[PDB]
């Protein structure tokens, strides 16, 4: 809910009503005459971010597999098979 509120007040014009009228007039006049979120990145930076995310994903999966190998149950199963 706080995310929704922050986004809404981010998009909102900067003057509280009844003043709002001024911001709306300004916006309409500029539209007729002429972001922190959802920004698009240059190709190099986009590629670097994709690669960094992939590397982080690989590290996360490796950490999962490692903590699974040294789990108590996996150690016991390995020990039982090896002792047999």
């Amino acid at each position: 809910q706080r995310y929704n509120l922050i986004v809404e007040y981010h998009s909102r014009p900067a003057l509280a009503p009844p003043f709002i009228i001024i911001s709306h007039i300004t916006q309409a006049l500029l539209s007729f005459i002429k972001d922190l979120l959802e920004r698009e990145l240059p190709s190099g930076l986009d590629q670097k971010l994709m690669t960094w995310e992939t590397v982080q994903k690989e590290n996360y999966l490796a950490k999962l597999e490692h903590e699974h190998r040294e789990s108590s149950g996996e150690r016991l199963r390995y020990t039982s098979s090896k002792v047999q």
């Binding site: 190709s43 190099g44 590629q47 670097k48 690669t51 960094w52 992939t54 590397v55 982080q56």
Partner: protein, 418 residues
Amino acid sequence: RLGDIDFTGVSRTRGKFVRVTSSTDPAEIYQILTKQWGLAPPHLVVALMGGDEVAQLKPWLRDTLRKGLVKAAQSTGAWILTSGLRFGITKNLGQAVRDHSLASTSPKVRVVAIGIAPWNMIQNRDLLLSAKPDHPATYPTEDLPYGAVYSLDCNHSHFILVDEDPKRPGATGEMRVKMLKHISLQRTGYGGTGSIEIPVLCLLVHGEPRILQKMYKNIQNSIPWLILAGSGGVADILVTLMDRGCWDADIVQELLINTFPDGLHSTEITSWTKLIQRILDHGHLLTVHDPEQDSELDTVILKALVKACKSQSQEAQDFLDALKLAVAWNRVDIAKSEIFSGDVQWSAQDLEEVMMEALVNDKPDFVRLFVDNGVNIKQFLTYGRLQELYCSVSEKNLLHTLLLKKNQERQAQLKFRF
């Protein structure tokens, strides 16, 4: 003959290169690598000496090798000397190196994949023949089959393209040997104050008998060698001979014939037998890496380096270079097992510099080890040394910013940083 290459393909990348002849001095090449291209003197050099054969690595062995090599290299600044041609294990290593380079938060530590390739084996060499200083040459990347001509890997950052020698067709091998020997006689830092000799190491991956002369020359240059257990070629020969423990001419000849049936030349077979015997005669320079058992390439690298150092001599100063390597990689167990095991006498004055290095770089295990091995903190920690410890903060932690604010306040109110 300096130039730049702008690779065109799936991923755009820029690569530097230099032409060089078999009659050049390796000192010039090292000078241009360090200064002209701005590469810091590496803390570790690993050279790939195989993988160009038709048979290639097993996929699990291949991915374990690349993962281990990258993980070992990421700790410090490492060079990976490969035949920078897009083929075989080289392509996978280049891909892993570039992937790690992109996702590296610290630009200070860099893993550089250098490529030493022959001029005659390059595809579209005339395309890069331009090499305009203002305009880098455009080069297309193509994954050619085995054949006899390949294309330069896009992921290799720098290249050393050597011309074919009119005398013998081994210019690239001789250049590689000379480069490795020259690098082995350099210092890791800009100055020889906190610098070690650069640890040069070669990794063997499914060798063919045509590389035995170069391998023996490298061994004569006294550089460690790493052998993959499951590589396939000469690597299996060597690992089996180590398992046996002794090498006899008949045994090695039988192994050579069984492993490499295509080669049928009595003179060549006898020469290869002699070369294998002479290679195994050293032994201390040879180390086996079995990912099925250890799967920690850094551990095997450190063990090989310390073994070479111990075979060289027993003085504490000789081991000091390996000690700093162990400190750098948090291998307290390996250091304890190899260096700090009875043989080497260790004084308080010897460990002072290493104690400082382990203390600054946040290595508590090594601090504990050094304290237990004669370092007297009462003696060691003077007020000047404490101020030196406070000055050499990481510059990325809270204490650095707080001390910087305090220093700014002191300067505004108004040798050592803090």
